[PDB]
Amino acid sequence: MNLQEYQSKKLMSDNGVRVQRFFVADTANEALEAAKRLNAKEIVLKAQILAGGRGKGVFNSGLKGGVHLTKDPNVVGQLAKQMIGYNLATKQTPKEGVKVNKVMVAEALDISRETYLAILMDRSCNGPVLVGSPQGGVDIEEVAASNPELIFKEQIDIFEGIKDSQAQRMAENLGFVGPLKSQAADQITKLYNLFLKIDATQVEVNPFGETPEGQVVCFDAKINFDDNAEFRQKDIFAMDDKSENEPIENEAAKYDLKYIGLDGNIACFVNGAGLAMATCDIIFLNGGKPANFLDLGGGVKEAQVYQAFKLLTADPKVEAILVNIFGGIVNCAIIANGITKACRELELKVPLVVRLEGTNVQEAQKILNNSGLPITSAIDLEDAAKKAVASVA
Amino acid sequence: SYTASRQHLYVDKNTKIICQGFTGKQGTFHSQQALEYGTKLVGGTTPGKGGQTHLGLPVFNTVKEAKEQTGATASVIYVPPPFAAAAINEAIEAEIPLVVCITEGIPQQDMVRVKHKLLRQEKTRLIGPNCPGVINPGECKIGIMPGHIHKKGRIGIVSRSGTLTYEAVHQTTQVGLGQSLCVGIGGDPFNGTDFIDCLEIFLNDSATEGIILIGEIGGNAEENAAEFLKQHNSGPNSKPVVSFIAGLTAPPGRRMGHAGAIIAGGKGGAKEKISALQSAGVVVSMSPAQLGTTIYKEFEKRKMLENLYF
Numbered sequence: 001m002n003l004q005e006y007q008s009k010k011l012m013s014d015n016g017v018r019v020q021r022f023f024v025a026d027t028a029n030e031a032l033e034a035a036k037r038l039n040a041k042e043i044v045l046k047a048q049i050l051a052g053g054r055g056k057g058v059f060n061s062g063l064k065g066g067v068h069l070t071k072d073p074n075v076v077g078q079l080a081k082q083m084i085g086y087n088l089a090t091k092q093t094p095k096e097g098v099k100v101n102k103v104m105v106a107e108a109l110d111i112s113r114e115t116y117l118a119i120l121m122d123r124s125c126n127g128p129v130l131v132g133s134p135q136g137g138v139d140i141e142e143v144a145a146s147n148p149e150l151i152f153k154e155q156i157d158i159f160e161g162i163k164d165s166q167a168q169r170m171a172e173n174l175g176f177v178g179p180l181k182s183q184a185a186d187q188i189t190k191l192y193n194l195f196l197k198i199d200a201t202q203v204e205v206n207p208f209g210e211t212p213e214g215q216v217v218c219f220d221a222k223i224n225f226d227d228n229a230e231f232r233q234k235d236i237f238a239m240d241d242k243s244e245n246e247p248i249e250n251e252a253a254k255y256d257l258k259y260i261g262l263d264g265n266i267a268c269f270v271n272g273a274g275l276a277m278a279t280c281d282i283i284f285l286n287g288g289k290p291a292n293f294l295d296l297g298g299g300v301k302e303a304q305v306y307q308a309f310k311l312l313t314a315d316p317k318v319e320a321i322l323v324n325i326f327g328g329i330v331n332c333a334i335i336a337n338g339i340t341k342a343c344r345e346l347e348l349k350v351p352l353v354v355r356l357e358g359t360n361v362q363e364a365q366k367i368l369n370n371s372g373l374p375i376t377s378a379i380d381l382e383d384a385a386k387k388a389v390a391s392v393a
Numbered sequence: 394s395y396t397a398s399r400q401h402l403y404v405d406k407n408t409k410i411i412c413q414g415f416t417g418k419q420g421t422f423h424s425q426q427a428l429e430y431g432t433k434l435v436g437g438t439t440p441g442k443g444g445q446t447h448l449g450l451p452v453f454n455t456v457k458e459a460k461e462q463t464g465a466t467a468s469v470i471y472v473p474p475p476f477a478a479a480a481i482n483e484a485i486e487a488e489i490p491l492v493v494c495i496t497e498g499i500p501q502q503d504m505v506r507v508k509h510k511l512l513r514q515e516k517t518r519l520i521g522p523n524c525p526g527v528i529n530p531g532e533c534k535i536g537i538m539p540g541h542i543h544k545k546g547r548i549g550i551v552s553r554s555g556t557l558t559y560e561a562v563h564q565t566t567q568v569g570l571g572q573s574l575c576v577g578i579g580g581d582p583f584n585g586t587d588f589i590d591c592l593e594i595f596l597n598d599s600a601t602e603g604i605i606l607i608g609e610i611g612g613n614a615e616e617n618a619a620e621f622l623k624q625h626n627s628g629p630n631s632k633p634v635v636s637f638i639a640g641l642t643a644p645p646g647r648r649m650g651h652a653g654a655i656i657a658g659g660k661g662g663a664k665e666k667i668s669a670l671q672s673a674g675v676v677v678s679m680s681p682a683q684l685g686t687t688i689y690k691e692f693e694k695r696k697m698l699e700n701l702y703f
């Protein structure tokens with residue numbers, strides 16, 4: 001799930017982390033009043049959408065630029081009128097754009113210095129780790145490739161928690177001095193407890209910096225949430241804007257189906273995450289272009305199979321289907337009947353390759369060929385891949 | 394260290410099993426199959442149902458009682474995500490030698506806590522969570538894998554994937570090689586057993602003449618296993634290792650079903666895993682449908698070499 005910028009920074013502000021002051025306008029008038037209410041020497045105005053590169057985007061109203069600067073609250077009003085309601089296209093959105101419903105009206109703070117700081121559950125280390133760099137404002141990866149000596153890491157013991165010495169040391173290594181060291185050490189702490197409270201897999205502050213007046217401020221940040229912990233982050237996951245995902249993915253979600261859209265024309269659905277990724281690869285590997293990854297999960301139902309077929313048969317890109325199911329200890333004849341049932345009810349009109357495996361594959365390969373529907377069976381995963389790739393040209 | 398408990402992966406015909414979540418939908422079902430398979434399932438736990446009888450077997454309130462009353466040496470967990478990490482802890486505390494956690498969805502922070510206590514002892518070996526368990530064909534089966542596709546034999550299989558393991562199993566059964574011990578380490582990013590853990594057992598076991606390592610995107614365990622093979626499976630009398638690494642077409646930034654299967658910040662891609670594996674002597678099967686024929690051909694290549702030089 002993804003938070004809007006205003007949702008994620010409010011989350012941080014409420015937990016002691018310092019961010020730019022801001023308000024959230026639903027209307028051009030709201031943006032004007034907010035700009036007035038800021039006691040800000042300079043205002044920034046930012047379209048609230050999930051995609052990146054909002055900076056150089058375009059609006060149906062004609063406005064170039066999703067993010068704008070001005071000292072004049074009136075300017076905020078005008079520019080907001082050219083955002084709110086209209087649609088923002090970026091190098092991360094379909095040519096349609098995204099409807100902009102809210103804009104952030106924030107104070108713009110000058111940056112004197114820039115560091116990188118993230119808290120992260122590190123698989124290599126078996127616990128939470130602080131990762132900082134005195135070199136901020138650039139992507140962390142390029143920093144590690146060019147100057148690994150400027151990556152500093154502190155492992156935090158998850159029961160003992162973050163100790164003052166750990167925060168002092170990281171602050172020091174990122175080049176904060178004097179009263180800025182105290183602010184930075186304080187803020188590293190508050191960031192870390194924020195990261196445990198909300199069950200984050202990563203909290204990334206870049207730039208983690210200083211204002212000229214002497215203030216440590218997280219100027220921007222990205223939060224990654226553990227999907228597993230949703231049952232105990234009810235209030236946060238409720239903030240999720242499902243309206244910017246591929247709508248197929250959202251409908252799949254409604255049926256415990258794990259779907260992810262690829263740019264291809266051969267649709268596939270499989271029980272098992274890893275086998276679903278393998279089926280994507282083995283399709284491409286035989287020339288093809290897979291339309292999607294879909295994981296039915298462990299259990300195959302006459303009814304879940306229907307919803308999967310319902311999705312794929314509703315996607316305009318899809319010109320073929322490769323189903324590959326391991327029946328395990330269920331009679332694969334009772335799967336192929338779920339498949340012929342759903343394919344007749346859905347009026348299957350694209351060619352479907354089905355690989356089954358498990359008990360009674362013999363009577364199962366028969367129901368599939370005897371179906372009177374555009375269905376052909378396959379002996380193994382190379383067959384299905386090869387046959388499916390042939391079905392389009 | 395915790396590595397001492399690696400031997401407990403090699404479940405066998407004397408393994409005696411209890412089921413945590415025994416009276417639940419999946420505990421019940423896969424217990425019936427454990428009994429169909431001939432596995433020494435001997436009892437189970439459900440808080441608040443100690444005393445009941447289930448599948449002709451006793452139900453206990455705590456792992457500690459179950460261990461005392463039955464002599465159990467291994468535990469399998471079908472406990473729902475909010476409580477499963479607590480179940481794992483109870484079994485570490487109960488000092489159960491081998492614990493298999495089938496549960497998907499345990500919070501990562503939970504598993505960091507579980508791992509914290511796990512790594513600080515050596516009586517208990519954890520496989521999982523989010524895995525299908527371990528099977529010694531014909532001798533002992535802990536988890537959800539279908540028994541009937543297996544056949545006792547010579548290939549060790551370790552794998553982050555459940556359904557992909559079945560492919561490997563079926564293929565190595567189809568080519569006639571059989572499996573010595575399969576271990577599904579599951580698809581979570583924080584878990585109790587990596588590839589290296591299974592390789593040390595495979596390498597030290599004589600029943601295991603070949604290894605298949607099935608991996609996927611995310612983390613660095615494939616890369617670590619590549620290094621390990623360089624130190625422990627070089628020189629002569631080395632065992633062939635065929636691997637398949639899934640997710641070559643996976644888009645970055647996305648969880649590909651498994652919570653642990655995601656490329657982020659450029660780390661965790663499939664092709665980095667193939668290079669690193671291939672640099673240790675590992676034969677990567679391009680196609681997931683060819684694990685069996687590739688490990689098979691690998692044995693042929695060694696036989697052709699012996700015929701050539703005599």
Ligand SMILES: CC(C)(COP(=O)(O)OP(=O)(O)OC[C@H]1O[C@@H](n2cnc3c(N)ncnc32)[C@H](O)[C@@H]1OP(=O)(O)O)[C@@H](O)C(=O)NCCC(=O)NCCS
Pocket residue numbers: 298413414415416417418419420438439440470471472473474476479480495496497498523524525554555579
């Ligand atoms: C763990 C999982 C299987 C449970 O599903 P389920 O069996 O349908 O669940 P149930 O609702 O029957 O609950 C199981 C039992 O756990 C019991 N339980 C709860 N806490 C427990 C504990 N600490 N110890 C023991 N039992 C416990 C419950 O009381 C329930 O028994 P009851 O219904 O008789 O009271 C499910 O959450 C899951 O992980 N799904 C499958 C994931 C998967 O495929 N992973 C494999 C990766 S290859």
